[PDB]
C-alpha cells in the first residue's frame, strides 16, 4: 500500500528527458523545485523514482561525486527499476546537499540513456489554501 | 469574515489573464468553463460552492453571471462597479456539478473606455470545492524495488 499517515500527502512532478552530454546526477534541490506544496516548513518522508536505463550500472543517493560502494544499487538494460528512499522526516535544509547518481556501464552520453518516471514524494500536508484576508472588500 | 470552509472543501486558485485591447465594441465575457479549466483538483464528480472574483475597472459598467452562455446581464441579478474601485463577488454556485455550471459566464457591460487594453483587470479565481480524492502514485509503481 501506497497509503500516508493521515497528516501527509504524495506530490508528484515530471522529470526531464535526458540530453546528451560530453557522471549523471539529479539533485534532490532540483526534484522539489517549484512544488507548490512544499515551503521551507515542510517535512519529507519518502521519495520514489521509477526508471529505464539503456545499459546496466548503478545508483545511489549521495550527499555532498561517486555513491557510496557499499549500499550501491544495481539495475539492468531495458528493466523497469525503482527505489522508495526513505527521507526520515527531515527538511529541505538538511537534503539540499542530496543528490541520485546513476553510473553506466555503457552509452555514457548517450540522449535518454535514463529516462525517469515522474518523482513521487510523501510530504508533511501543506497548510491549506486560502484566499486573502482582505478578498470580499466592496463585494456588497 | 474568515474564509474557512466546511467539510471537506476545499479552495482552489487560477491566475487570470489580463485583457488585450479589442476591435469590435462588444460585451465582455468569461465563461466559467474556462475559469476550471486546468485545475487538477477538479473531475466530473467535483461540487462547486463558491466562486470569488475581484477587479478594477477603468470604467462605471455593470456585471453578472448569465446561464445559457453576448447579451447584456439580466436586470435581475445585476451588479453595479465603479470606476477605479476595487470590486468583489462571492457567486453561489450551489453544490452544482460542473456539467449544470458550464453554461454560465460572467458579464461585464462598461459604459466607456469598452475596448482599452487592461479595461478590466481580475485578481486571481477563487472556488471552493469538494475535496478531492487524494494524489497515489500507479500501483505498480514500485516494482522491481528490491
Known amino acids: 500500500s501506497l497509503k500516508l499517515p493521515n497528516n501527509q500527502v504524495w506530490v508528484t512532478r515530471k522529470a526531464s528527458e535526458w540530453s ?15 512544488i507548490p506544496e512544499i515551503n521551507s516548513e515542510t517535512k519529507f518522508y519518502r521519495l520514489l523514482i521509477g526508471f529505464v536505463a539503456v545499459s546496466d550500472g ?7 561525486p561517486d555513491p557510496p560502494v557499499v549500499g550501491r544499487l544495481g539495475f539492468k ?9 526513505d527521507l526520515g522526516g527531515k527538511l529541505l535544509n538538511q537534503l539540499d546537499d542530496r543528490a541520485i547518481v546513476w553510473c553506466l556501464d555503457e552509452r555514457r552520453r548517450d540522449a535518454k540513456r535514463v529516462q525517469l518516471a515522474g518523482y513521487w514524494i510523501a510530504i508533511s500536508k501543506p497548510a491549506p489554501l486560502m484566499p486573502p484576508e482582505d478578498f470580499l472588500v466592496n463585494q456588497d
Do not use: H, L, Q, W
Request: glycine share 10%; aromatic share 12%.
Open 20 to 34: 546528451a552530454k560530453t557522471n549523471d546526477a539529479i539533485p534532490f534541490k532540483t526534484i522539489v523545485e517549484g
Open 58 to 64: 548503478t545508483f545511489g543517493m549521495v550527499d555532498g
Open 77 to 85: 538494460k531495458n528493466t523497469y527499476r525503482s527505489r522508495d528512499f
